[PDB]
């Protein structure tokens with residue numbers, strides 16, 4: 001059921017901002033690893049004495065990487081005279097965030113009808129304010145409320161190209177990389193306590209619970225009216241033999257934070273071929289592939305959706321497959337993006353639920369916890385028996 | 387003249403350590419941009435709860451990238467029980483260094499006969515101690531003294547493979563990249579006052595002044611007995627029309643620090659072809675090339691060393707050329723390695739001074755300050771006149 005209870009008009013995911021020690025090196029690594037183009041910048045060369053911010057894009061996916069300069073460069077500025085292009089940025093907040101959590105997502109940004117109204121309604125309904133609505137060049141409004149941990153939900157609204165003060169990148173520095181990624185599908189947080197986190201976020205957004213279909217986790221998914229903004233949240237489950245991976249996350253991250261970003265590809269086979277070719281030459285590594293038994297079991301589970309050849313291509317690339325009552329999902333996960341075993345990326349492509357494709361078609365892959373465990377058990381038994 | 391006055395036995399440059407916010411992303415960017423292989427690691431997977439350190443190598447060049455984990459992971463350790471593989475590492479020092487200076491070189495490491503004796507002799511002769519000699523696994527000794535700013539000169543000596551506690555990298559993660567770089571030629575510091583810096587470093591090393599052959603700088607070069615360890619130092623010159631680039635460095639770096647690393651290539655043409663192909667797909671950018679007049683003037687300056695075709699290849703790749711009374715130098719410079727206009731890299735190859743090739747053959751390219759200025763003037767006059 002979808003009660004369509006959004007308290008303000010939400011459009012789509014807009015961008016994700018990483019807070020970095022050095023934005024240049026992270027942005028260049030991510031560009032090559034994910035096939036995203038350098039599309040905009042705000043830094044010393046554009047008159048920003050406060051922070052360096054670089055924007056990568058692939059289709060509608062926008063990744064922003066931001067790091068602070070020495071405060072001495074802007075020591076004479078005040079907020080009314082700032083050269084920062086992102087008015088919510090603060091040197092101390094950014095250094096403290098990065099010291100505490102390491103490389104990770106500071107902002108999950110959604111485009112809304114009116115960021116000032118979204119902010120006001122959110123705070124009136126319990127949201128903890130983080131940055132008030134600020135109008136940039138009478139053209140774009142940006143505001144921020146706390147989401148979980150030190151992650152903020154950022155609202156952006158446009159009167160009518162990323163943000164004023166950003167310059168498009170001269171095409172010599174903009175190599176047109178593209179491995180097929182096209183948009184952010186969902187963004188997932190890890191929290192110590194799921195219940196209060198859900199009550200808080202659903203309380204101030206009106207987002208509803210998205211319908212779902214040992215593990216070490218409990219999870220639930222909040223969704224916007226058209227279910228195109230999807231925000232799963234996990235908590236750890238204490239009491240099992242293999243330690244909860246969510247708890248390990250919270251320890252290494254110093255608390256709640258963004259766990260994974262799921263990036264929709266329009267051709268997950270091409271995306272994974274391209275990303276895997278680059279894993280050991282500066283790109284991203286992937287989780288170890290499931291055993292051949294997992295792909296043997298795929299035929300019985302999705303043989304009506306995927307041909308034998310398409311299943312064998314999934315096996316070549318290590319792709320996981322899960323299925324709903326309405327759709328089928330192809331997914332795969334990277335190893336952690338940085339030094340700490342915290343944030344990682346998921347590549348996903350969904351088949352079915354055609355109307356456009358409805359949001360969340362096929363679910364989030366919860367069935368693969370069981371299917372993976374099952375397939376490993378079968379594989380070890382096959383090996384021992386042979 | 388070479389008085390050969392080293393106060394202890396110095397062998398060669400050993401490694402350069404960068405202090406990072408996230409070592410993984412910087413190391414992966416540098417690996418792809420410079421063609422260096424991942425060769426060793428010390429991190430959570432090797433039992434190090436304190437810092438993540440990744441070693442890249444190309445020939446004898448060794449770049450180490452280190453970042454701190456959350457202090458909470460090691461909060462119960464003391465130095466006698468540490469899981470750090472680099473005993474001089476400190477969470478607070480590393481965060482403070484990076485907050486102050488951004489991404490840059492913390493340690494210039496030279497291999498010596500006996501690091502404990504080198505440390506003792508250095509401090510007895512004025513060196514400010516930074517980390518005392520520590521013997522690792524009865525096999526390697528490491529010690530550190532202050533060089534300039536927050537850069538240390540690190541001594542390493544081996545009884546008899548990088549450092550105990552580091553693990554060789556499984557060849558699946560070790561792609562055998564190689565663009566031709568083979569060793570560190572020189573490492574250059576920017577300081578506010580050259581005189582005292584030289585007196586200090588030459589005071590405690592016994593290094594002698596290496597013989598040299600508007601600019602905004604004064605510079606001098608300290609050298610070990612066989613002139614294979616080369617440490618140029620620059621100070622700003624105030625009073626000119628175009629602001630001293632050394633002063634700009636000191637402002638953005640919050641003081642003295644390492645300005646550039648010069649990496650010797652065994653085939654500078656191949657190195658630059660490979661690095662330039664990757665500039666816009668995650669690698670390093672280069673300074674704008676000199677005008678065609680510079681390469682027209684090359685024929686009159688080095689036509690006896692380089693054929694017309696070799697000169698045209700220099701022009702294709704933007705390579706600069708300078709000449710001594712003893713040798714010729716091919717060189718080119720990157721744009722800054724990170725967000726701040728501070729540290730950059732030089733690629734160099736030297737021809738002549740055969741005995742082995744003597745250190746510093748051809749100088750450091752000081753003649754290119756004049757030759758570049760001259761050639762730009764000629765080019766603008768050609769364009770206006772045509």
Ligand SMILES: CS(=O)(=O)c1ccc([C@@H](O)C2[C@H](O)CCC[C@H]2O)c(Cl)c1OCCC1OCCO1
Pocket residue numbers: 186188219220232233234245260262287333346364365366367368369372
């Ligand atoms: C074992 S799994 O079936 O690989 C698998 C399936 C689905 C999802 C996610 O996308 C899900 C979704 O977005 C929200 C709901 C819950 C969440 O779990 C993951 Cl995070 C996942 O774990 C991958 C990394 C990890 O590496 C070691 C073990 O797993």
Ligand SMILES: CS(=O)(=O)c1ccc([C@@H](O)C2[C@H](O)CCC[C@H]2O)c(Cl)c1OCCC1OCCO1
Pocket residue numbers: 572574605606618619620631646648673719732750751752753754755758
């Ligand atoms: C104009 S230059 O002739 O490109 C040139 C020639 C030689 C050297 C160095 O290696 C030299 C050496 O190691 C030690 C002695 C002095 C030092 O200067 C440089 Cl740093 C250099 O500037 C490059 C970057 C900068 O970018 C904008 C202007 O220059």
Ligand SMILES: [Co+2]
Pocket residue numbers: 186188260262346364
């Ligand atoms: Co997911």
Ligand SMILES: [Co+2]
Pocket residue numbers: 572574646648732750
């Ligand atoms: Co140089």
